Amino acid sequence: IKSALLVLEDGTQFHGRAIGATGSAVGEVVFNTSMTGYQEILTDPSYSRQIVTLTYPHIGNVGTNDADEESSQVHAQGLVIRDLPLIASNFRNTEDLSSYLKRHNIVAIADIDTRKLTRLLREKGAQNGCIIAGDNPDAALALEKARAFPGLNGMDLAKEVTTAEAYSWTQGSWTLTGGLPEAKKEDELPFHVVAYDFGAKRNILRMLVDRGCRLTIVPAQTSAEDVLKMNPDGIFLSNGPGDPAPCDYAITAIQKFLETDIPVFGICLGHQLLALASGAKTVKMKFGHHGGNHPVKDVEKNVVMITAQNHGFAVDEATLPANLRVTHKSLFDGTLQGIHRTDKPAFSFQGHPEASPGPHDAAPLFDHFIELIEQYRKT
């Protein structure tokens, strides 16, 4: 019997079984409705300082494998699931989930009422929490650790997950037949795009190269100046953890980029930056958007897309400068999903066009970016 326990701020306790590493974990507790893609979810930098609870009871049915890693490591602070399957049954599986969590030293519990928990989060809103996996989990200590958490609000996490130095990315996407392709010769890739690592997911990068872009991955606090020196075909602003609001360095930069004619495209966090730099305000959601079944409408086309969502902050539509048009909107709750600058080659999306895991419905958003680049190069 390996105990594990989860206690929330509110003192709500969840008694379960330990399936990962021994120890404690603390962060914001969130729920994700994704019935597939657990591995991709765990390795999503956006999840830094977050304890993840998955709605789908059976997490681990297909084990794990390297190709399903969205980053170099598991960024999620902890994992909460209903059932941990006896085995992994997938030709792609290279390592069972328990061993994998253990390997990556992740604190995680199973066998709890993930439903009860979800309802609580959705009703009362996000809550910081703590997991304690050990011989005799101390409920008090847990609550203490939980209450003591500083809180994502106003927390710059982007600076904690970004790359030390910059680097190049010329790798495209996976295929069933071919798996993960060898990385593309630099001379082989048409466009050069500079991308700000705010805790960038590999799939984004891969989908860019897939589109003819060579990439230069830069640290978060990189200066616009340093960038403009590179003679970028376009600039990219990745996804990433925490509050977009305290990221002064990037907002500033972005603004500089905004004086140029350079094409600018942002995803998730990047979308929030683009907005802030644009003059709008952000807000922290009650519980956010975490799942892969989220309908979003391209208002312009009046069409719907099923999308991958991972965000706890949003752009307040009501503070939008006018140089900022509304492009997309959540069909679930009315919240802001996309924007384009009326005056510049700059646009962004709140969900994940790159999915992984999730519907490939929003992928074409990239296409537009390219369109801006190609036209830029035309000039």
Going by the annotation, the residues of the binding site for L-glutamine are 46, 240, 242, 269, 272, 310, 312-313
Of 284-313, binders to Cl ion (CB under 5 A) are 284
**Positive or negative, the Cα torsion across 357, 360, 364, 370?**
positive
Q: Given the rule CB under 5 A, which of 67-75, 124-132, 276-284, 339-347 is the region that contacts Cl ion?
A: 276-284
Smallest gap from Cβ 295 to Cl ion, in A, equals 24
Q: Any catalytic annotation for residue 354?
A: yes
In angstroms, give the least distance from the CB of 268 to Cl ion.
17
Give the footprint of Cl ion on residues 99-118 (CB under 5 A): 112-113
Q: Which is nearer to K ion, 111 or 160 (CB)?
A: 111
> CA Rg, the chain, in Å?
20
Active-site annotation holder among 9, 40, 268, 289: 268
* In the complex, minimum distance from the CB of residue 352 to another protein, in angstroms, rounded to a whole number: 17
Helices 248-257/269-276 angle, 10° precision: 70
Tell me which of K ion, another protein, Cl ion, none is bound by residue 283, counting a contact when its beta carbon lies within the kind-specific cut-off of 5 to 8 angstroms.
Cl ion
Binding mask 57-96 for Cl ion (x = CB under 5 A): ----------------------------------------
- 111 is an interface residue for K ion by CB under 5 A: yes
Nearer to Cl ion, 136 or 231 (CB): 136
**89 — phi, psi (to 5°)?**
-125, 85
Binding of K ion by 210 (CB under 5 A): no
The footprint of another protein (CB under 8 A) covers 31, 33, 55-58, 61, 82-83, 85-87, 89, 112-113, 115-116, 118-119, 122-123, 291, 293, 332
Which residues, 23 to 42, sit near K ion by CB under 5 A? none
Strands 264-267 and 346-349: parallel
User: Smallest distance from the beta carbon of 33 to another protein, in angstroms?
Assistant: 5
> 283 vs 363, which CB is nearer to Cl ion?
283
Chain residues 181-200 in contact with K ion, contact rule CB under 5 A: none
Give the shortest CB-291-to-another protein separation in angstroms. 7
| Binding test (CB under 5 A) with Cl ion, winner from 8, 14, 85, 222 | 14
Catalytic residue set: 268, 352, 354
Rule CB under 5 A: which residues touch Cl ion? Answer: 14, 112-113, 283-284
